[PDB]
A paper describes a structure:
The cow antibody repertoire contains a unique subset (~10%) of antibodies possessing ultralong CDRH3s, which can reach lengths between 50 to 70 amino acids. The unique [name] structure can be separated into two microdomains where the antigen-binding disulfide-bound “knob” sits on top of a long b-ribbon “stalk” and can bind to both surface and receded epitopes. Ultimately, we isolated a total of 8 and 11 cross-clade nAbs from cow-485 and cow-488, respectively, all of which had ultralong CDRH3s, suggesting only ultralong antibodies were responsible for cross-clade neutralization detected in sera. BnAbs from cow-485 were named Bess, while bnAbs from cow-488 were named ElsE and assigned numbers based on their order of discovery.
Author numbering:
A (entry chain L): 1 to 9, 11 to 27, 27A, 27B, 28 to 95, 95A, 95B, 96 to 106, ...
B (entry chain H): 2 to 82, 82A, 82B, 82C, 83 to 101, 138 to 174, 178 to 262
The structure:
Amino acid sequence: QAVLNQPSSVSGSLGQRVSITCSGSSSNVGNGYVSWYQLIPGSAPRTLIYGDTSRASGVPDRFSGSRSGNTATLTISSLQAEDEADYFCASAEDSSSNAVFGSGTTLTVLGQPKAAPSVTLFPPSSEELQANKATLVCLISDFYPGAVTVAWKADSSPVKAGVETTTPSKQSNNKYAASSYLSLTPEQWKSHRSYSCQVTHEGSTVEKTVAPTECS
Amino acid sequence: VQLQESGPSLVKPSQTLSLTCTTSGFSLSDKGIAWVRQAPGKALEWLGSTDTTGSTNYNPGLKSRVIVTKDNSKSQVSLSLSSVTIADSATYYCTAVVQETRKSTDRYELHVDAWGQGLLVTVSSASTKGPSVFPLAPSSSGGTAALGCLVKDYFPEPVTVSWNSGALTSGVHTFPAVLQSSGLYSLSSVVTVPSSSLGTQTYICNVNHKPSNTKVDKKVEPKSC
């Protein structure tokens, strides 16, 4: 599949303007009628621009398109937090029934407040323990920027085995979520006084602790 | 106004992937419909539309593997993708498109006007496996309590979780799944509620894993001991 050339990432500050380019040959971008699409995680793609410069229905004026030869540009002014998304261009190639898409440009909006993660930690359920399994569930939400590291402690000792942690993902409030699962035997779980899920975000570590004596 | 994808979430290598798009809110006979897919972190990929023009194979990978048809009696647009490999794993979108030749030099106009929600398709030989569902009881905090459900060891994606049959949406947070070295997924859904409501309100998570026809309603309550 042919792909149009886009920068992998762009950044702009709150209230400022950013430009995203879409580069191809005389037979795709050079034919004009480039379109632009906004992909926000968890939502259907949204058409922003078509025909190089025409805004789709519902799209405010601060989204504008232009073209200079074989490079088309999407410009977003008055950046706000909700503009963080992946932006894809497209155009027909050789026929009106064949589209080529760009590789996508991820937009980061700078100047936003740091937001520390909220942590919820669940011990293994009595049902799971009866099934001879045990899972500690560490749920991490409402953090920005979207990067955390997770460390598990048994009492105060590090645990490395049995840990699976997700990539961070956008929530619906512009912040990020992640989850970490620690798999233990019921014997391991009961053999310690407590377990802790420690989440480090931008150099600050937040934690929760659970103990096998709690009811679950 | 509506583009509803349907079809299997799991297909085995070498088989044919068949999806359906059921349209509503416009005359299907008078609008182009196209299939677009996206692999995680990769570019959108055009598969085909209900109206092909020109005569070329602009994609060696999809060379003669795609068939798109329109069934006007059912307001349905079909996709057939033959001889799938694991590379065909992706989210498949039904779209409404504008296709024009504008011209004098012929210039080709093609853009997507509307996008469906997308349907996740995993190509794999692994068998489907339904989840085990465990309650995550609320513990002993600003007047609120967190309770949830653990949806453990299922394949393939996706899983849906509702609470109280959809009546409860405020304070619900369903987290993306983790993928374990076993090849199985686990996710959790948590709902934040007033601590005072724990003695007068019942909380049930409704887990639906379509690929395995698994439907579980799990009551989540405080636990005493």
